[PDB]
Chain A
Amino acid sequence: XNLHFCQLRCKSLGLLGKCAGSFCACX
């Protein structure tokens, strides 16, 4: 993945959010 909320969650912790399969990961 829900890329929009993924980027929002990660970004809130100073990281980038990308989809990994149907999953969400912070790089």
Chain B
Amino acid sequence: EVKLENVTENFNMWKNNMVEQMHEDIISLWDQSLKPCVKLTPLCVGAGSCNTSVITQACPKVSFEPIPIHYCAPAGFAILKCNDKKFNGTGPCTNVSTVQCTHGIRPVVSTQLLLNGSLAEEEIVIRSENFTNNAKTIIVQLNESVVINCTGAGHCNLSKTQWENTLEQIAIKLKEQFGNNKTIIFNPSSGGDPEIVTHSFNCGGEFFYCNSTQLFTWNDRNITLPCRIKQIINMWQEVGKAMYAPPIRGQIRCSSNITGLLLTRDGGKDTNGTEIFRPGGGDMRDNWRSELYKYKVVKIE
């Protein structure tokens, strides 16, 4: 009389131990592959006062290529994969499967735009821990890559109809989450550290900072953006400033596929039937989430 049944499970891309594990992992990978020449980081005591700590170490820079990594399940546990269409990322999944390792991932540290990630199968999907809460980041997953090619010439090229269509479809999904009679407008970052204010990322081991104003100024040919490579920067693994070694060659190239974005919606009790969105990012954890949102490690029982 016993009946057969598919084992469903509840996922929460926003509370995933795999994300935190990867964050510490990417960090370890870096500290043993791209150390700074000088690292200045805060050093505080309970009282509340702080003195600056300076660390000088060998900072050998070697040409770096993308090493694909994935996460596998240790003896005793299993990794569930949600396979539902346009999965929200939170709640119970129906068509679930099991895998030995996650898909192949090419980690990339960045802000505003997500690079060389996994695309959406169906159409564009936007996900947030809570859309009503404007203080929560919205992770946009594109279903179609937009190539952006850089050059030490100080500017990265990007299609204009490609990226204009991208904003046009993203805006549509935002209306499906906030309202169809609402007006969507994209605005640049409201400010902060340069890394936050610009589309910054690390390519080949260099830190690029590109102006993204032309990318986030829209009302519902090539688009060249001014990029600059810095040697002194604010660290992403922790609060502090660091100075990395100067570029080896000269004219540092970079080819990447924009697969997603990190956006925030301006909070406003302002009843105006219009919602504004700016480029977000900063916590590389959301970056790790956009890739691990459909995974959940569970105990074999």
Contacts and interface: CB of A to CB of B under 8 A. Distances in A.
Interface of A: 2, 6, 10, 13, 15, 17-27
8 contacts: A10-B192, A21-B282, A21-B284, A23-B193, A23-B234, A23-B236, A24-B192, A25-B189
Nearest to A17: B192
A19 B42 CA distance: 15
Given A10-B191, A10-B192, A22 B281 contact: no
A25 B198 CA distance: 11
Contact of B190 (A2, A15, A21, A24): A15
A7 to B, nearest CB: 11
B237 interface: yes
Q: Which of A2, A13, A20 has the most CB of B within 10 A?
A: A20
B239 A22 contact: yes
Nearest to A23: B282
Given A2-B42, A2-B239, A23 B191 contact: no
Interface in B177-200: 189-193, 195-196
Interface in B229-286: 234-240, 264, 267, 280-285
Contact of B196 (A13, A15, A20): A20
Interface in B75-118: 111
A12 to B, nearest CB: 11
Contacts of B196: 20, 23-25
B285 A21 contact: yes
Contacts of A17: 192
B207 to A, nearest CB: 13
Given A2-B42, A2-B239, A24 B264 contact: no
A25 B281 CA distance: 10
Contacts of A19: 282
A4 to B, nearest CB: 9
A25 B42 contact: no
Contacts of A20: 192, 196, 280-283
B191 A22 contact: no
Contacts of A6: 192
A22 B236 contact: yes
